[PDB]
Amino acid sequence: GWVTFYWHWKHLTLWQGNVAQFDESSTYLMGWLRDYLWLNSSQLINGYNPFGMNSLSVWAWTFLFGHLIYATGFMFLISWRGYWQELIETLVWAHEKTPLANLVYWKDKPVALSIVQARLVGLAHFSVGYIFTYAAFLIASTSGRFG
Amino acid sequence: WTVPTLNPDTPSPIFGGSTGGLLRKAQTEEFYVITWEAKKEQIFEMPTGGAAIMRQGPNLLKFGKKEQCLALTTQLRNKFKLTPCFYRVFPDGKVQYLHPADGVYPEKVNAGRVGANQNMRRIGQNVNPIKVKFSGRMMSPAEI
Amino acid sequence: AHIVKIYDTCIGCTQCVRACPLDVLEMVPWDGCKASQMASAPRTEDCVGCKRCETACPTDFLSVRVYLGSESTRSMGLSY
Amino acid sequence: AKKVKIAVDRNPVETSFEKWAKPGHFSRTLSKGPNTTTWIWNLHADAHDFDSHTSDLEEISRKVFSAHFGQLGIIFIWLSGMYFHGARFSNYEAWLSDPTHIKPSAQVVWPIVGQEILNGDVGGGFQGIQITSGFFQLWRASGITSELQLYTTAIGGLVMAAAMFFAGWFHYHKAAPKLEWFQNVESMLNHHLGGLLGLGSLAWAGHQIHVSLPVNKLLDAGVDPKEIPLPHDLLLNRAIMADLYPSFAKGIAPFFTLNWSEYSDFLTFKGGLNPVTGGLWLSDTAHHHVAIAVLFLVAGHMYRTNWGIGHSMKEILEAHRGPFTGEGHVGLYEILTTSWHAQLAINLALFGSLSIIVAHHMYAMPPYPYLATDYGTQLSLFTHHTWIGGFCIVGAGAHAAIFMVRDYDPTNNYNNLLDRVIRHRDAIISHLNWVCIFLGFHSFGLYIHNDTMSALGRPQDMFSDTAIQLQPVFAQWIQNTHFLAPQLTAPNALAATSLTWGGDLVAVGGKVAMMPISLGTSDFMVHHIHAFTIHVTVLILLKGVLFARSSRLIPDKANLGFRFPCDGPGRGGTCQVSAWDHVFLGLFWMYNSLSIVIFHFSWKMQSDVWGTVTASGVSHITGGNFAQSANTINGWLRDFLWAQSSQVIQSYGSALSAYGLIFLGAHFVWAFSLMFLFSGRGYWQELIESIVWAHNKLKVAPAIQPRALSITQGRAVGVAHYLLGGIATTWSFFLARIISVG
Amino acid sequence: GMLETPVTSAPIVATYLSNLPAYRTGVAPVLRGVEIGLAHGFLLAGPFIKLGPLRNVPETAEIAGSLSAAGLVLILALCLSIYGSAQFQSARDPLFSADGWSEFAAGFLVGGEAGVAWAYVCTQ
Amino acid sequence: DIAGLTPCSESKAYAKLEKKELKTLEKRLKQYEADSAPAVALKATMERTKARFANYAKAGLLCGNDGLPHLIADPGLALKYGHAGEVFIPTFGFLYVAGYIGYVGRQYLIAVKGEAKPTDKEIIIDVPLATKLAWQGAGWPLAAVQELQRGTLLEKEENITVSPR
Ligand code: CLA
Ligand code: CLA
Ligand code: CLA
Numbered sequence A: 001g002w003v004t005f006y007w008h009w010k011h012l013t014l015w016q017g018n019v020a021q022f023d024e025s026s027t028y029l030m031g032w033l034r035d036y037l038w039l040n041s042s043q044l045i046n047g048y049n050p051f052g053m054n055s056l057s058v059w060a061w062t063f064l065f066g067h068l069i070y071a072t073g074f075m076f077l078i079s080w081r082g083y084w085q086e087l088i089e090t091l092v093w094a095h096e097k098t099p100l101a102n103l104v105y106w107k108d109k110p111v112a113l114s115i116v117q118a119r120l121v122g123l124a125h126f127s128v129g130y131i132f133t134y135a136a137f138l139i140a141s142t143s144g145r146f147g
Numbered sequence B: 001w002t003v004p005t006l007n008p009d010t011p012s013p014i015f016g017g018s019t020g021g022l023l024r025k026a027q028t029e030e031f032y033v034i035t036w037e038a039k040k041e042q043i044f045e046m047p048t049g050g051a052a053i054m055r056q057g058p059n060l061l062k063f064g065k066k067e068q069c070l071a072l073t074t075q076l077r078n079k080f081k082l083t084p085c086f087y088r089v090f091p092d093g094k095v096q097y098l099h100p101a102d103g104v105y106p107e108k109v110n111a112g113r114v115g116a117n118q119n120m121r122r123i124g125q126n127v128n129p130i131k132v133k134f135s136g137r138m139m140s141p142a143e144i
Numbered sequence C: 001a002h003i004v005k006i007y008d009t010c011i012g013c014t015q016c017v018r019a020c021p022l023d024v025l026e027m028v029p030w031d032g033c034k035a036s037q038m039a040s041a042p043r044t045e046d047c048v049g050c051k052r053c054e055t056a057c058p059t060d061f062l063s064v065r066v067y068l069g070s071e072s073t074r075s076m077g078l079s080y
Numbered sequence D: 001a002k003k004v005k006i007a008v009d010r011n012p013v014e015t016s017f018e019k020w021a022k023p024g025h026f027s028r029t030l031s032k033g034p035n036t037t038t039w040i041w042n043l044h045a046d047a048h049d050f051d052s053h054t055s056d057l058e059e060i061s062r063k064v065f066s067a068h069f070g071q072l073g074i075i076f077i078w079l080s081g082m083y084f085h086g087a088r089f090s091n092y093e094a095w096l097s098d099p100t101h102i103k104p105s106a107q108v109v110w111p112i113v114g115q116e117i118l119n120g121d122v123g124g125g126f127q128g129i130q131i132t133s134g135f136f137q138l139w140r141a142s143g144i145t146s147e148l149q150l151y152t153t154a155i156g157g158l159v160m161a162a163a164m165f166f167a168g169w170f171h172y173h174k175a176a177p178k179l180e181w182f183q184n185v186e187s188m189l190n191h192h193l194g195g196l197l198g199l200g201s202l203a204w205a206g207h208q209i210h211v212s213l214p215v216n217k218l219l220d221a222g223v224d225p226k227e228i229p230l231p232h233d234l235l236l237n238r239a240i241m242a243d244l245y246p247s248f249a250k251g252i253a254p255f256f257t258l259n260w261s262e263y264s265d266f267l268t269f270k271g272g273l274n275p276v277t278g279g280l281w282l283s284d285t286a287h288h289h290v291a292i293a294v295l296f297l298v299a300g301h302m303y304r305t306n307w308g309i310g311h312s313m314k315e316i317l318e319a320h321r322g323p324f325t326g327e328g329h330v331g332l333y334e335i336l337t338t339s340w341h342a343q344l345a346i347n348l349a350l351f352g353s354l355s356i357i358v359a360h361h362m363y364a365m366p367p368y369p370y371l372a373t374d375y376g377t378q379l380s381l382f383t384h385h386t387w388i389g390g391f392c393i394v395g396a397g398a399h400a401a402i403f404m405v406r407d408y409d410p411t412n413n414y415n416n417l418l419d420r421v422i423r424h425r426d427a428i429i430s431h432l433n434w435v436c437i438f439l440g441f442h443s444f445g446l447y448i449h450n451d452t453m454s455a456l457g458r459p460q461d462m463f464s465d466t467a468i469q470l471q472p473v474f475a476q477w478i479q480n481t482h483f484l485a486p487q488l489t490a491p492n493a494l495a496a497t498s499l500t501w502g503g504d505l506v507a508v509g510g511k512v513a514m515m516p517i518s519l520g521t522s523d524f525m526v527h528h529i530h531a532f533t534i535h536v537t538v539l540i541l542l543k544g545v546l547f548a549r550s551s552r553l554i555p556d557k558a559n560l561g562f563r564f565p566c567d568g569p570g571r572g573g574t575c576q577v578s579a580w581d582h583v584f585l586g587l588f589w590m591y592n593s594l595s596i597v598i599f600h601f602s603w604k605m606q607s608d609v610w611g612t613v614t615a616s617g618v619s620h621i622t623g624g625n626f627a628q629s630a631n632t633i634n635g636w637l638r639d640f641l642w643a644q645s646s647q648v649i650q651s652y653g654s655a656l657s658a659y660g661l662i663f664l665g666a667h668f669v670w671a672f673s674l675m676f677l678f679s680g681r682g683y684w685q686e687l688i689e690s691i692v693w694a695h696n697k698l699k700v701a702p703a704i705q706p707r708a709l710s711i712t713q714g715r716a717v718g719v720a721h722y723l724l725g726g727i728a729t730t731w732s733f734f735l736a737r738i739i740s741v742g
Numbered sequence E: 001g002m003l004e005t006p007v008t009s010a011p012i013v014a015t016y017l018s019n020l021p022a023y024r025t026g027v028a029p030v031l032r033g034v035e036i037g038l039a040h041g042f043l044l045a046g047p048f049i050k051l052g053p054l055r056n057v058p059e060t061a062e063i064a065g066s067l068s069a070a071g072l073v074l075i076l077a078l079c080l081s082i083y084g085s086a087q088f089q090s091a092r093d094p095l096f097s098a099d100g101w102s103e104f105a106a107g108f109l110v111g112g113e114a115g116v117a118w119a120y121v122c123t124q
Numbered sequence F: 001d002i003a004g005l006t007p008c009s010e011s012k013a014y015a016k017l018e019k020k021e022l023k024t025l026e027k028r029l030k031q032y033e034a035d036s037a038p039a040v041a042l043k044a045t046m047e048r049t050k051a052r053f054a055n056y057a058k059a060g061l062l063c064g065n066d067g068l069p070h071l072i073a074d075p076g077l078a079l080k081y082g083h084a085g086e087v088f089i090p091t092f093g094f095l096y097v098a099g100y101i102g103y104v105g106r107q108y109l110i111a112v113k114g115e116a117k118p119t120d121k122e123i124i125i126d127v128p129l130a131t132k133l134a135w136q137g138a139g140w141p142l143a144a145v146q147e148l149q150r151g152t153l154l155e156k157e158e159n160i161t162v163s164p165r
C-alpha cells in the first residue's frame, strides 16, 4: 500500500505538471491525507448523487463495496469462535421447537467456523476489501482526471 | 464390585423444567443418565441452568452429552459428598455403564487396570515428521 | 477422535485425571516413578480436546499430550 | 426488629507507610513479589477487586465506602480547577458584556516550542483555547459576575476536596461503619430521597429565587454587570427585590397563608425559551426545583426505620406475586443487600440511561443563557453525555455477569423470577437473535437498496420522500400533540416545553437557537438503525449474563470464573466464551451504535436547525441536505464525512491546528489497536524469546522474566486503544468543524 | 422435561395445526403438495406486482409481477425436490420418505403455478 | 550547490517564506492595543521568527526549490563543505548519550544480580546505587571497549538457553 500510494501520488503530480505539490506536501502525513486521499476522492464519490449519475458510478459503488468487505473481515478477526458456537446452539433449539419448520431438518449439524478457518476467512475479506477499495479509487481518480 | 443395572423407574429431582434439556439427538443417537443416592432433600444447580431439589433416596437425571453428566458428578461429589454414577443409553434400548468404569473413581489407582496410550519415551524423543510421511494418512510422529 | 499420549516422565501426581472433564484418563500401577503409578488414556473416544490435562501437568516438558484429530459428535462436544 | 443505629469499630486499621512499600499486599497471590512481568499487570488489574481480596462482606463494604470518598475528593479538585481557571486564565468578565461575539476561553498555553499559536483570537483582548464545556453559560445562570466569585468557589472546592480525603481516611482507619450499618437500605433511601435530592433541590431553589433570578433579570435588561447589585445586597434589602419582583413586598406570609398565587411573578409556568437569551426562563426553573423539592421530601418518608410507620421493602417485594411467575420477587431483597455487584449493575444501567436522557433534553430545552446559539457547546454536551451513558450501560452488563458468577447461590433462588429467567434463556436469546437479524435487513438493507438504485440511475425506485416513502407517522403525531398541549391538555402553560414540536423559531444574535424539527423518510430510516444497533448490544450483553454460569457448550462455566480466555481448542474451539468477553464484544457494538447517534445529531442539527437568520429567512450550515442525501451510504460518506472533515484537515497553521494533530494521532491509535485484536500471544512469546537471547548474550537480561501479555489483556488492550482512537477521531472532527463554522 | 408453556402446549393451538395440510395425515402426499402450493402460490404474486420494477406501468405491471411469481415457484419446486433427494436416501407418515417427498414436490409445482395463474385471473 | 541546492541566505523562496510568516503575525497584531498582553506576546513571536530565519541562513544551510532547509547526511559531503553540524556531529552526540543510558542500566542490572532477591531490587529501585552508577557512566566508551577486549562483554554460547533445533 505504501509503495502504490507513493507511485500513484508522485505520478499524478507529474501528469498534472505540478510536481511541487508532492515535493512540499509529502514530507508530513497530513499532506498525504489531505492532498492525496481527500483531494482525489472528489470525483469518485460523485459517481452517483441525489442529482444523477455518470460513468464513474460503478467505481463509486465498488469503492463502498470494498469498505464493506473490509469491515466484515474485522468480525472474523476480532470476535472468536466460542461466542458464535454458543449462539448457534440457541438457533438449533429454536428450529427444533418451531412448528411447521421442524418438519424440515438439516443433514450436517450446524457449528461455528473453526479457529483456523475464521482467521483465513477474516484475512480473505480483509484482503478483498483492501484490493477492491484501492482499485476503484486508483482507476477513478486517474481516469476521471485525464481520461 | 459388579456393574450396576439401571432402573428406569427411579424417581427424579423436583425440577420445573427448562429449555436447556434434551434435543432431537436423544431420540436418534444417544443420551446419558446419571443416578445417585441422596441423604436428605437439598437444592443443587442443574448444568443445563436453574436449580433443582434432590429427593431423599435414589435420584435420576437425563442429559444430552457426557460432559453434562460428569459436570453434575463433580458438584455432587465435591460439595454434597455423594457418589453418583451415569450411563450411556441408546435409542434401541441398550444401556452402557461408565464412570466408574471399574467401580473406583479414576483419580485413585486400582489394580487390574491396563495402561493405554502410554509411550515409554519422552516428548523430545519422537521421530521427525519426514519419517512418518506417505504412511497412508496424516500421522503424527507421536502415533508411531 | 483425538490422540492422547502419556510419556514416561509422568510422576503420578494424578492432576491430569482430576482435571479431565470427561473421564478420559485414569491412573494405573507402575514402577517407573516414586508414586508407583502412571496416567492412562483408555477412553480417548470421549476426549473433546480441551487440554485441561496439559494445563495441570507439572512435569517439563509435559508428560501428557493431546493431538487434535478427526472430529465427531463426541469430540466436537455437541448435544444436538 | 433490629433498630437503625450508628455502628462503627474504633481504629480498625493502622495508618502506616509500611504497606506502601510492599506492592501486592492486598492479595495472597501477589504478596510474594514478582518473578515474571505478568505480576506487574496483575497488580493493577486486581487492585480494586475488593470482593476477591477478602471473603468478609464487612471488610469489602468499608473499602467501598472510603474509595468513594476518594472519588468525591478528586471531583472537587477537578471542579476547583475549572472554577480557578475561569478566574485566572479566562475572558469571562469580557464575555459577560458581549456574550454573542466573544468566544468562551479558559485555558492558556505557555510560549514554548512554538505552541503559542494555539492561543487563538477569542475576543475581549484575550488569547486562549476556546472551550466547549459550557461553564460560562452555567456561571451566568447562577449569577456569577466577577472573577472574585469564581476564585472563592475554587478555594471552597479545595477545602471540600480536603474534607473528602479526610472523611475517607477517618471512616476506614479511625471509625469504620460495621456491616449492619451498611444494610439499612430503608434508612439510606429515606435520607437520599428527602435529604440528598430533596433538600438539595430546595437549597438550589433558594439560590435561584434570591440570587439567579434578580441578577439575570438585570443582565437581560442590559445593565452593565459591574453595576448590578451584589447577591448579598439583594438578600439583605427586601426593598431592592420588591422593585424587581413586587411579590417580595409581602414577605413569606403568602406561603404560610396558602396565597401561593401571589408569587406568580417569579414562580412562573411560561414554557418555551427566553427570547433575549434563548434559554429557559429562570422563573420557570425556580418553580421546577421548588416542585421537585416537595416531591422528593414526601418521597423520603416512605420507608420504615424506627417508628413503625412506613413500608418494609422486603414486604413489598414478597407481596407482588402472580400466577405466571411462580414465587415472584422472593429472594431479591437478600440479593440486593448482600451483593455490591448486583447493586452496581442496576445503578450503572439507570445512571447511564439517565445521562443519555440528559443529552436529549438539554439540547431540545436549552437550560442556560446563550447555550443554544453556541453550537460548539451544544454539540459537545450532547456528545459527551451520550458517551458517558453508553459506557455505564455496558458496565451494567459487566457487573450483572460478575454477580451471576460470584454472588449467585441456587439455594436462595428456587422458582423465583431470577430462577425462571435462567430456565428459558434459550427462548430469550433465540428470539432476540431473530429480532436483530430482522432489524438489520429491514433498516440497513434499505440503505443498500437506495445505494444500488441510485447507482443504476433509478432514483424513482429509491426509498425517499420523492419516491417510495416511509413517513414516521407515529412520531409526527406526537410532535403535533405536544405542540397543541397548552390549548387543552396543559391549559395553564403559556407555551410548549420545546420549540422542536412546532411553532416559530427563536433567534438570538442573528443565529437560530431552536426551531421545529421535521421528521421525514431519512429520519425514519436512521431511527430504525438506532433500534437495530441497540438491540444487538442488548443481545451480546444479555447473552453474557444469562450464560455466565453454564451453556450447552461449557456446562461448568461458573467454575472457570468470570474472566478467562477460553476452555481450549476442544469442542471445535471455545475462544471468548467467558462473560467478560461478552462485555469486550459489547463495547465494540456500543461504540458502533453511539457513533451513528452522534453523527445523526450532528448532521440533522447543521442541516435543519442551526444556521444564520437573515432578511429572506434561515440559511442552515449544510443547507438542508440531510433530507435528500442521508438515505444512502454514499450520501453519508460524501456529504457528511468527506465534506465536513474539510475544516479539520485545513487546521494547520491556525489556532485549531491542534485538532488536526489529534485527528491524525487518533487515527494512529485506532489502527495500532488492531495489532492486539488480530493477533495472539503465542506469536509474541516466541518473539520475546529471540529478543531475550540477545540480552542474555550481552549479560543485560532482566531478573523479572519478560512475558507476552495474557490472552485477556491482549483483548483489553485492544479494545481500549480501539475506543480511544475511534472516539478521539470524532472528537477532533466535531470540534474543529463546529468551532470553525458554528 | 421441556419448559411447558401455553404456546408450546395449548388445546386451541394444537387443533389448528393438526388441520393444516402439513400435519393432516391420511392424505396422499401429492394432494397435500397441491393444497400447500396453491396457498403460497396465490400469495406470492402480491409483492411482485405492487413493488416490482414495472409496477408503475398500467397493464404490464400485472403480467410482469405474476410472471416473476411463477418463476419463484419454479425455483422453490427445485429446492423441494433436491431436499428430498438429500434427506431421504435409505417414517410413520408417507410424506417423509423418498417416494412421498418426490410426489410432494411435484404437487407443489402444479399447485403453485395454478395459484399464480389463478391470482392473475383475479386481477384480469 | 550540492545536489542542485542553494544556500538559504541566497534563496529567493526562503526570503519570501519569512515575509509570509511575519505577515500572518502582523495581521493578527493590528486587532489589539499597542502594549496589551496579546500584543506583547505577538511581538515576541515575531522577534523569534526573525531570529530563526537569520540563524538558519547564518548557519549556512542549503535550501531547495521549496525554500526550506535540507540536511546533508554523507560524512564526506558534510566535512567537505562544512555541514558537519547537521547530521554528522549530532550522530556522535546521540550515541554518547544512548550508550550512557544503556551502559548505566546494564551496570545496575549486573550489580543487583548478586543480591539475594534481584527481583525486588527492580520494582523498588536502589536509589543510592543508581546515583553512584549514574555518575560513573560518563566514561562508558572507555569502560565498554575494555570489557570487549578482555572478553567479559559477552556470555558464553554454552551458558545461554536455546530451543530445540
Ligand atoms: C497518608 C495517609 C494514609 C496512610 C499512611 C494510609 C495507609 C494505609 N491505608 Mg489508607 N487511606 C487514606 C490515607 C492513608 N492510608 C485516605 C486518605 C483514604 C481515603 C481514600 C484511605 C483509604 C484506604 C483504604 C480504602 C484502604 C487503605 C489501606 C491502607 C493500607 C495500604 C495503602 C496502600 O498500599 O497505599 C498505596 C496506594 C497508593 C499510593 C495509591 C494512591 C491512590 C490515591 C487515591 C490517588 C489516586 C490518584 C488518581 C489515580 C489520579 C489519576 C491518575 C492518572 C493521571 C494516571 C495502609 C495501612 C488499605 C488496607 O488497609 O488494606 C488492608 C485499604 O484497603 N486506605
Ligand atoms: C441527609 C443525609 C445524607 C446525605 C445528604 C447523604 C449524601 C450522600 N451519600 Mg449517603 N447515607 C446517609 C445519609 C445521607 N447521605 C445515611 C443515613 C446512610 C446510612 C444508611 C448513608 C450511607 C451512604 C453510603 C454507604 C454512601 C453514601 C454516599 C453518599 C454520597 C453519594 C454521592 C453524591 O451524590 O455526592 C454528592 C456530594 C455532595 C453533596 C458534597 C459532599 C457531601 C455533602 C457535604 C453532604 C454530606 C452529608 C453527610 C451525611 C452529613 C454528615 C457528615 C458528617 C459531619 C457526619 C452523598 C454525598 C456514597 C458516597 O459517595 O459516600 C462517600 C456512599 O458510598 N451514603
Ligand atoms: C432553602 C432555601 C431558602 C432559604 C435558605 C431562604 C432564605 C431566605 N428567604 Mg427565601 N424562599 C425560598 C427558599 C429559601 N429562602 C423558596 C423556595 C421560596 C418560594 C416560596 C422563597 C420565598 C421567599 C420570600 C417571598 C422571601 C424570602 C425571604 C428569605 C430571607 C428571610 C426569610 C425569613 O424571614 O426567615 C425568618 C426566620 C428564619 C429563616 C430563621 C433564622 C434562624 C437563624 C439562622 C438561627 C441562628 C441561630 C444562631 C445560634 C445565632 C447566631 C449565634 C452566633 C453569632 C454566636 C432569607 C434570606 C424573605 C426576604 O427577605 O427576601 C429578600 C422574603 O421576603 N424567601
Ligand code: CLA
Binding pocket: D044, D045, D046, D047, D048, D049, D050, D348, D391, D392, D393, D394, D395, D396, D398, D399, D402, D563, D580, D583, D720
Ligand atoms: C461506578 C463505576 C464502576 C465501578 C466502581 C467499577 C468497579 C469494578 N469493576 Mg467495573 N466497569 C464499569 C464501571 C465500574 N466498575 C464500566 C462502566 C465498565 C464498562 C467499560 C466496567 C467493566 C468492567 C470489567 C470488564 C471488569 C470490571 C471490574 C471491576 C472491578 C475491578 C476493577 C479494577 O481492578 O480496575 C483496575 C483499574 C485499571 C486497571 C485501570 C483501567 C484503565 C483504563 C483501561 C484506561 C482507559 C483510558 C483512560 C480512561 C483515558 C486515557 C489515559 C491516558 C493515559 C492515555 C471493580 C469491582 C473487573 C472485575 O474483575 O470485576 C469483578 C472486570 O473484569 N468492570
Ligand code: CLA
Binding pocket: A068, A071, A072, A073, A074, A075, A078, A079, A083, D433, D434, D436, D437, D438, D439, D440, D441, D444, D445, D448, D536, D539, D540, D585, D588, D589
Ligand atoms: C460491516 C461490518 C459488519 C457486518 C456487515 C456485520 C454483520 C453482522 N454482525 Mg457483526 N461484527 C462486526 C462487523 C460486522 N458485522 C465487527 C467488526 C465485530 C467485532 C466487534 C462484529 C461482532 C459481532 C457480534 C458479536 C455480533 C454481530 C452480529 C452481526 C449480525 C447482525 C444481525 C444481522 O443478521 O443483520 C443482518 C445482516 C446484515 C445487515 C449484513 C449485510 C446484509 C446485506 C446488506 C443484504 C443481504 C445480501 C443479499 C442477500 C444479496 C446476496 C447476494 C450474493 C449471495 C450473491 C450480522 C450478520 C450479531 C448477530 O449475529 O446477531 C444475530 C452479533 O451477535 N457482529
Ligand code: CLA
Binding pocket: F074, F075, F076, F077, F080
Ligand atoms: C552509507 C554509505 C555511503 C555512501 C553510499 C556514500 C557515498 C558517497 N560518499 Mg561517503 N562515506 C560514508 C558512507 C557512504 N558514502 C561513510 C560511512 C564514511 C566514513 C565516515 C564516508 C566518508 C566519505 C568521504 C571521506 C568521501 C565520501 C564521498 C562519497 C561520494 C563519492 C565516493 C563514495 O563514497 O562512493 C560510494 C561509497 C561507497 C562505496 C562506500 C564507502 C565510501 C568511502 C568511505 C569513501 C570514498 C571516498 C572516495 C575515495 C573519494 C574520491 C574522490 C571523489 C571526488 C571521486 C558519495 C556521494 C566522497 C565525496 O565527498 O565525494 C563528493 C568523499 O570524499 N564519503
Ligand SMILES: CC1=C(C/C=C(\C)CCC[C@H](C)CCC[C@H](C)CCCC(C)C)C(=O)c2ccccc2C1=O
Binding pocket: D675, D676, D677, D679, D680, D681, D684, D707, D708, D709, D710, D711, D713, D714, D715
Ligand atoms: C504487540 C503485542 C504484544 C507485545 C506487547 C507487550 C509485551 C507490551 C509492551 C509494554 C511495554 C512497551 C514494555 C514494558 C516497559 C517497561 C515498563 C519499561 C519502560 C521504561 C521507560 C522507557 C518508560 C503482546 O504481548 C500481545 C499479547 C496478546 C495479544 C496481542 C499482543 C500484541 O499485539
